[PDB]
């Protein structure tokens, strides 16, 4: 079980992709997975360890390029529209 990085995962055939982390969601002992306001699975119980894991979606966003006009120059700047700059370099 690999935490804190983006992976494909499969728990008992519940497949997905995302970042797995430890969780503050205090499931009752019979609860098996957690689900959000959009009815999306957002936490799960590990079938071997019985630990609760949060699932966070793998980072993404829009990308847009700022141009001084080609007639002026061919250099540009880039905006990663809703990310922290810490996340950005793995866009490569």
């Amino acid at each position: 079980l690999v935490k804190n990085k983006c992976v494909n995962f499969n728990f008992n055939g519940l497949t997905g992709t995302g970042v797995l982390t430890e969780s503050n969601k205090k499931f009752l002992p019979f609860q098996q997975f957690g689900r959000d306001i959009a009815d999306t699975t957002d936490a799960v119980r590990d079938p071997q360890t019985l630990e609760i894991l949060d699932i966070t979606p793998c980072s993404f966003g829009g990308v847009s390029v700022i141009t001084p006009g080609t007639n002026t120059s061919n250099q540009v700047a880039v905006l990663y529209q809703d990310v922290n700059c810490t996340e950005v370099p793995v866009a490569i």
Partner: peptide, 23 residues
């Protein structure tokens, strides 16, 4: 300003160009 009161699905909100400070 006191009276008046998903992203993972590909929805987003872009910020306005002028801040409330500028208005």
């Amino acid at each position: 300003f006191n009276k008046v009161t998903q992203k993972f699905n590909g929805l987003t909100v872009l910020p306005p160009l002028l801040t409330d400070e500028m208005i």
